[PDB]
Amino acid sequence: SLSVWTASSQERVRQDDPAGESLNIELFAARGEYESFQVALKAPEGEHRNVHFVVSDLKGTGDSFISKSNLTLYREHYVYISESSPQRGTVLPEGPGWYPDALIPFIDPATNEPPSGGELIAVPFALENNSNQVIWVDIQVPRDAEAGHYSGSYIVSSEHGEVTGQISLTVWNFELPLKPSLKSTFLIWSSRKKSTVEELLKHKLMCQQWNLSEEEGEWIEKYGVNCSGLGFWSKADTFNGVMPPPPTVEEIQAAASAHPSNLFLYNYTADEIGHYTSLYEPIKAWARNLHEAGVANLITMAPVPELYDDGSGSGRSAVDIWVILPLQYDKDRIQEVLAKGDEVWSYNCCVQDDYSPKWQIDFNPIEYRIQPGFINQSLGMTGILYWRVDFWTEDPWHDVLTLRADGMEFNGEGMLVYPGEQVGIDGVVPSIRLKAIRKGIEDYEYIEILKNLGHEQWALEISQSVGPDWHNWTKDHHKLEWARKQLGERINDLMT
Ligand SMILES: [Mg+2]
């Protein structure tokens, strides 16, 4: 009458999926890393109306433990998609239906206690309809955790049953830096709360406030902030091939002085202005001034040889951080700009090709993880951008069709967090897709550690087995987990 099973972090559990074969879980992680798993529940006969869920400490040798304080629990909320995202090529969405995505937190981060009052509450819950309920479990490994094996439990209980499963965790003898190696720019347009920034930083994502009106050292020390934008927006975009004269060298220096002097600074100058060759000399004029002031120029455009020199005589490109879609990738031009000292980042939106990972709810969950980590590393890319995180509809917990344009509908476009009000909290809550992006950032970190230990070629051979390019990446979470384990076991070996 009470069927319980586990699923890996990037395995989608549908409401109608059959019970799996294991109720235990075996995980592996470094210090300073998250690993996650899911507990799925089904009532194949009747109803349990009052279901609770708890976890224990993870016990290691003797007295040794990882506290349950390091585990974060949520109940998955399913949202109904009535209109598919675009269907093209071989990378297709899974069809209209119920999708798990919003995460109902057991604990309000502001109180460290359960919410009350919410329209939706994590626990207790009812198990109905033969229809699955799913608990998401995050484990954060403490930076001081001794390497070795730890075991704890989860307990599912109701008025008519109780089932207990094992959580096995092996902690490897290495640590992910607090400051992530992968840089990012995720934009926030409407939610000005400190809690919204904080929710992103906790998932290893760097964010910038967009569209601010005229009216951090802590976040660095706590969350390892690794870059910051200065916010001189030229206003030039895909529809506006026009640019004003640049801020002056000392104007750029003045904005920069509001940040710590050790923090990597960029400027998001212009957006998708690639077709406007009109703008090359103005771009070079902006670049020369940023360069004199020690600031990187970031534009969402593909490398063009005309901009590989800023006209200052130094040889330096006019764009320092080239931000491209998967479909724009050109091996020869990317190798040229990497070789001369630039960065290339990836970004994603809509459904613009037949083959690339796509960022909508109705695609395979793996697509949010595979881009920042394995594919970026295989192609030498060092960052990720996303245009918006808070693009909510009027009914954000029930309607995720966030963009309708040109006969197409997009489910989750520009939307990675949900407002807290519906669950009785102030401030936003994560989605399952945000957890995948976090995991990809940690995947990127594994490869970076191996490069730094002098094992770049082997690391990239492993990276090419699951994420070699934008066309031939794995759709199988089991194979991705395998690849990651190979990396972690090698690092562990090298550090012992
Ligand atoms: Mg349609």
Numbering used by the authors: 9 to 223, 232 to 512
Relevant lines from the article:
Beta-N-acetylgalactosaminidases (β-NGAs) hydrolyze the different β-GalNAc linkages of various glycans to modulate the length, combination, and abundance of glycans. Despite low sequence similarity, the crystal structures of these enzymes demonstrate that all enzymes share a prototype structure and have diversified their substrate specificities (oligosaccharide-releasing, oligosaccharide/monosaccharide-releasing, and monosaccharide-releasing) through the accumulation of mutations and insertional amino acid sequences. The overall structure of these enzymes is similar to that of CpNga123 and BvGH123, which consist of a β-sandwich domain at the N-terminus and a (β/α)8-barrel domain encompassing the catalytic region. Among Groups 1–4 and GH123, the DE motif is located at the same position, suggesting that these enzymes adopt the substrate-assisted catalysis reported for GH123 MR-β-NGAs.
Surprisingly, Group 1 NgaCa displayed strictly OR-type enzymatic activity and acted solely on Galβ1-3GalNAc-β-pNP. NgaCa in Group 1 had the simplest structure among the enzymes analyzed. The active site of NgaCa possesses a cleft shape that allows oligosaccharides to pass through to the −2 subsite, enabling oligosaccharide binding and OR-type β-NGA activity. Furthermore, three characteristic tryptophan residues (W197, W218, and W249) are located in the subsites −2 and −3. A docking model of NgaCa with oligosaccharide suggested that these tryptophan residues may play a role in a stacking-type interaction with sugars located in subsites −2 and −3. This structural feature indicated that Group 1 enzymes may act on the inner regions of longer sugar chains, in addition to disaccharides from the non-reducing end (e.g., Galβ1-3GalNAc-β-pNP). By contrast, no inhibition was observed in Group 1 OR-β-NGA even at a concentration of 100 μM (green). This difference in the inhibitory activity of Group 1 enzymes can be explained as follows: the monosaccharide reaction intermediate-mimicking inhibitor (GalNAc-thiazoline) does not bind tightly to the substrate pocket of OR-type enzymes. The increased number of residues could potentially reinforce substrate recognition in Group 4 and GH123 enzymes. Additional structural analyses (comparison of crystal structure with AlphaFold2 predicted structure of NgaCa, comparison of apo1-form and apo2-form of NgaCa, and comparison of GalNAc-thiazoline-bond form and GlcNAc-thiazoline-/apo-form of NgaAt, NgaDssm, and NgaP2) data are illustrated in Supplementary Fig. 13.
